[PDB]
Amino acid sequence: VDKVDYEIDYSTAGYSFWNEVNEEVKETTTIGKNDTEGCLEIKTSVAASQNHFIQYHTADNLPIEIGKEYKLKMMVRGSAEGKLNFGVGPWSGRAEGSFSFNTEWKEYEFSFKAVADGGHVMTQSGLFVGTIQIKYVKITHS
Numbered sequence: 819v820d821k822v823d824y825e826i827d828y829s830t831a832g833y834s835f836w837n838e839v840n841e842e843v844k845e846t847t848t849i850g851k852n853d854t855e856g857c858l859e860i861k862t863s864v865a866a867s868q869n870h871f872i873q874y875h876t877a878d879n880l881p882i883e884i885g886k887e888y889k890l891k892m893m894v895r896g897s898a899e900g901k902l903n904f905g906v907g908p909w910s911g912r913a914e915g916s917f918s919f920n921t922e923w924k925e926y927e928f929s930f931k932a933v934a935d936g937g938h939v940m941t942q943s944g945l946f947v948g949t950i951q952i953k954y955v956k957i958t959h960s
């Protein structure tokens with residue numbers, strides 16, 4: 819069993835986490851809740867010049883300890899095929915990876931050793947044009 823250390827479930831939760839849309843793409847980007855689908859939604863009509871120019875925490879206050887093994891689980895879809903970059907950890911340093919999403923609601927998992935104590939799920943998608951939807955984020959261990 820993947821025992822759940824942490825969950826944020828956007829099926830019901832609102833969104834209050836840190837996010838930063840670079841001024842380059844401020845007019846054409848939105849980050850917030852879609853209360854009909856029941857998900858976090860990141861919508862873009864213009865690609866940014868850098869992927870980190872649309873960056874947002876999808877989870878925070880994580881109960882992770884340096885050197886322990888976990889999984890990050892995220893349920894994601896998009897309006898077209900694309901890539902979500904992430905890191906799990908504090909601002910000093912993270913365990914990094916990416917998910918390649920499609921138009922179906924699917925769960926993605928990333929196994930990692932924590933590189934630090936605590937932190938957040940930094941998520942970046944500035945190069946993606948369209949709609950990204952995120953249903954939940956979990957941290958688990960075996």
Ligand SMILES: O[C@@H]1[C@@H](O)[C@H](O[C@@H]2CO[C@@H](O[C@@H]3CO[C@@H](O)[C@H](O)[C@H]3O)[C@H](O)[C@H]2O)OC[C@H]1O
Nearest residue numbers: 836837838869870871873874909910940941942
């Ligand atoms: O991918 C990298 C980006 O994530 C990075 O963005 C900056 C990251 O630091 C942010 O500032 C933090 C704000 O919260 C405080 O508590 C922290 O101490 C600050 O460091 C800043 O707002 C982001 O622009 O830019 C570099 C990219 O490689």
